[PDB]
Design a protein around this ligand. Sequence first.
Ligand SMILES: CCCCCCCC/C=C\CCCCCCCC(=O)OC[C@H](COP(O)(O)(OC[C@H](N)C(=O)O)OP(=O)(O)OC[C@H]1O[C@@H](n2ccc(N)nc2=O)[C@H](O)[C@@H]1O)OC(=O)CCCCCCC/C=C\CCCCCCCC
Ligand SMILES: CCCCCCCC/C=C/CCCCCCCC(=O)OC[C@H](O)CO
Ligand SMILES: CCCCCCCC/C=C/CCCCCCCC(=O)OC[C@H](O)CO
Ligand SMILES: CCCCCCCC/C=C/CCCCCCCC(=O)OC[C@H](O)CO
Ligand SMILES: CCCCCCCC/C=C\CCCCCCCC(=O)OC[C@H](O)CO
Ligand SMILES: CCCCCCCC/C=C\CCCCCCCC(=O)OC[C@H](O)CO
Ligand SMILES: CCCCCCCC/C=C\CCCCCCCC(=O)OC[C@H](O)CO
Ligand SMILES: CCCCCCCC/C=C\CCCCCCCC(=O)OC[C@H](O)CO
Ligand SMILES: CCCCCCCC/C=C\CCCCCCCC(=O)OC[C@H](O)CO
Ligand SMILES: CCCCCCCC/C=C\CCCCCCCC(=O)OC[C@H](O)CO
Ligand SMILES: CCCCCCCC/C=C\CCCCCCCC(=O)OC[C@H](O)CO
Ligand SMILES: [Ca+2]
Ligand SMILES: [Ca+2]
Ligand SMILES: [Cl-]
Ligand SMILES: [Cl-]
Ligand SMILES: [Cl-]
Ligand SMILES: [Cl-]
Ligand SMILES: [Cl-]
Ligand SMILES: [Cl-]
Ligand SMILES: [Mg+2]
Ligand SMILES: [Mg+2]
Lengths: 204, 201
Amino acid sequence: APHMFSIRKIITISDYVTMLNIITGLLAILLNSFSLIYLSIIFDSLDGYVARKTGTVSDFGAELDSISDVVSFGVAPAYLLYNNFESNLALISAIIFCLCGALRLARFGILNVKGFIGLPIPAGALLLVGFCQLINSYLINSILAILIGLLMISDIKYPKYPNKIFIYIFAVSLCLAIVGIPHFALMLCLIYAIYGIIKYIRGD
Amino acid sequence: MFSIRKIITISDYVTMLNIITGLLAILLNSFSLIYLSIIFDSLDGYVARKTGTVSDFGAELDSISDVVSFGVAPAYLLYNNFESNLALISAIIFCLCGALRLARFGILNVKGFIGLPIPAGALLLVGFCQLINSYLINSILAILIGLLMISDIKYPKYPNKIFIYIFAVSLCLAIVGIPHFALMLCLIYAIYGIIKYIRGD
Ligand SMILES: CCCCCCCC/C=C\CCCCCCCC(=O)OC[C@H](COP(O)(O)(OC[C@H](N)C(=O)O)OP(=O)(O)OC[C@H]1O[C@@H](n2ccc(N)nc2=O)[C@H](O)[C@@H]1O)OC(=O)CCCCCCC/C=C\CCCCCCCC
Ligand SMILES: CCCCCCCC/C=C/CCCCCCCC(=O)OC[C@H](O)CO
Ligand SMILES: CCCCCCCC/C=C/CCCCCCCC(=O)OC[C@H](O)CO
Ligand SMILES: CCCCCCCC/C=C/CCCCCCCC(=O)OC[C@H](O)CO
Ligand SMILES: CCCCCCCC/C=C\CCCCCCCC(=O)OC[C@H](O)CO
Ligand SMILES: CCCCCCCC/C=C\CCCCCCCC(=O)OC[C@H](O)CO
Ligand SMILES: CCCCCCCC/C=C\CCCCCCCC(=O)OC[C@H](O)CO
Ligand SMILES: CCCCCCCC/C=C\CCCCCCCC(=O)OC[C@H](O)CO
Ligand SMILES: CCCCCCCC/C=C\CCCCCCCC(=O)OC[C@H](O)CO
Ligand SMILES: CCCCCCCC/C=C\CCCCCCCC(=O)OC[C@H](O)CO
Ligand SMILES: CCCCCCCC/C=C\CCCCCCCC(=O)OC[C@H](O)CO
Ligand SMILES: [Ca+2]
Ligand SMILES: [Ca+2]
Ligand SMILES: [Cl-]
Ligand SMILES: [Cl-]
Ligand SMILES: [Cl-]
Ligand SMILES: [Cl-]
Ligand SMILES: [Cl-]
Ligand SMILES: [Cl-]
Ligand SMILES: [Mg+2]
Ligand SMILES: [Mg+2]
């Protein structure tokens, strides 16, 4: 309503990181690049940190963070699975995956302080793109796409903030994943995901 | 294990069909599924209010579905079918602008639209892409739509029964390969919005 482009008046320096995230997420689809999903995970960790450090946390930025997660962690991995493993089964699996990412983002939007309920969408997306790069099988990667989707919409608790050590080596491994070597990021992400399930089943 | 199923409404299932068609617009490279998404996007909130199943989860899933169907998929459909540096940058701006207005809309609760609504933007881009064989012109329009989408131009939220009667038919005509009337109806809506803003009335 105010003249033409009043939306610049609510954009912060954090939103610019978020937009970088949206670009890398969209380019993951447009260029068929797993490499850019790993960059998206780095940016998705960076935009909330910049918000808190620079003191520019905003509701608009919180919403754009989620919207960015849809592109890069919900649409893009499902696109990358189908485009690189074209089959009826990977079509249905990419659909489940994206839908499961969408529902946990919808559930995250309503309640989000406790931690992570279910596998967080950046971690799900890393698992899928990791499996897609290291396993040359549409059936298996189609199967895992559903298993990740089901974890994402689970009640399985996952901690929100890794320790300094884990951030440190996970940060390195995501960049190593950016340059073609995803094993350490995929391995680190499995341990996180599998440990969550074990705790749930064990009841601890 | 799966307490989420206690939250799902029957309108959420509509929203999920919307996400599916909007995702399949990307995966199958289908302009015609963008038009079905617009129909589903108008159906899920209607079914929500009609069935008494309005929820906050569903309000969010509705926006999340617009990201896929109307932000990501049209930018994809522009770059995939007009591969070029110019279309790449325009796809990026289109999507960014769709994301920014969805973010603004997410923190808003107003009677009309502020800026061009993202389903209307997605329609113009997809229509132009089908009826204009020119990456440059389509690349230009993508940016012009993005700017409209994040603008302060006021657009009405619910059309009159006559307009939705004709628009609905024209969306299905668009689905079977004839987008002219949907695109033409969407242009009247957008350009009339611009004129009223410029006129100031
Ligand atoms: C093809 C066959 C298939 C079917 C058959 C066909 C049947 C036919 C019938 C219907 C078909 C549709 C008819 C056309 C209407 C399309 C509307 C549209 O074009 O697309 C609409 C979005 C959707 O609307 P919106 O999306 O903003 O959602 C807000 C936001 N997304 C959020 O969710 O927060 O609002 P919603 O009603 O969906 O629900 C809002 C709330 O519902 C709750 N909620 C929601 C979900 C949930 N699971 N649970 C919840 O509880 C929840 O509370 C939510 O907040 O908007 C628009 O009008 C875009 C405007 C585009 C207008 C441009 C076209 C111009 C047309 C005419 C111009 C006139 C020209 C002059 C004419 C003269 C010459 C002739
Ligand atoms: C993506 C799937 C799309 C599916 C179709 C979308 C349109 C909704 C149709 C309703 C028909 C009547 C159903 C009403 C009675 C069934 C109750 C119900 O749907 O509940 C589900 C429950 O939450 C278990 O998860
Ligand atoms: C693709 C097929 C054709 C496309 C067109 C799709 C039409 C969908 C209509 C839904 C209305 C459902 C009727 C709702 C009946 C009442 C259910 C209910 O429980 O309503 C509670 C409410 O509070 C009481 O006013
Ligand atoms: C602070 C960190 C910021 C880092 C930077 C992020 C900026 C946003 C990303 C833009 C990618 C642009 C992708 C499009 C690539 C343009 C170059 C190109 O297309 O090349 C033209 C040449 O003519 C071909 O032969
Ligand atoms: C690739 C590596 C990227 C690394 C990214 C670096 C992010 C930190 C940069 C600036 C923070 C400080 C900026 C100063 C702006 C104002 C800060 C402020 O006032 O915040 C205090 C807040 O209230 C708390 O209590
Ligand atoms: C309510 C209206 C319905 C909405 C529901 C969504 C609409 C799109 C659904 C299907 C399009 C075609 C789906 C893709 C079919 C693939 C064709 C096939 O057989 O797959 C090839 C296979 O690899 C061997 O060649
Ligand atoms: C013809 C081409 C189109 C083919 C389309 C194939 C995919 C549709 C199949 C299932 C969707 C599942 C919906 C998303 C996952 C379930 C959502 C949900 O509500 O989960 C409830 C609970 O977690 C469990 O009971
Ligand atoms: C050794 C660890 C150090 C590495 C730290 C890196 C930090 C992030 C910097 C740049 C990432 C941007 C790279 C963008 C890559 C473009 C990918 C692409 O365009 O597509 C791939 C193509 O399909 C295949 O040929
Ligand atoms: C290929 C898949 C096609 C799927 C179908 C076509 C597209 C969906 C359109 C309309 C669904 C109408 C929804 C049916 C609403 C029934 C009313 C109702 O039963 O609502 C009770 C409510 O749950 C209170 O408890
Ligand atoms: C912090 C770093 C953040 C960086 C974020 C973005 C990373 C780079 C992404 C894409 C590379 C550009 C890909 C450009 C591909 C087309 C350019 C080109 O050469 O075009 C070929 C021909 O001229 C016409 O088809
Ligand atoms: C005159 C209008 C009468 C009513 C109109 C009917 C409404 C259509 C409803 C569902 C069809 C779903 C559309 C199927 C499109 C999926 C196929 C696909 O995506 O293929 C890509 C490309 O178009 C391959 O040629
Ligand atoms: Ca974030
Ligand atoms: Ca809607
Ligand atoms: Cl504005
Ligand atoms: Cl959560
Ligand atoms: Cl998440
Ligand atoms: Cl659950
Ligand atoms: Cl608005
Ligand atoms: Cl909108
Ligand atoms: Mg994010
Ligand atoms: Mg929607």
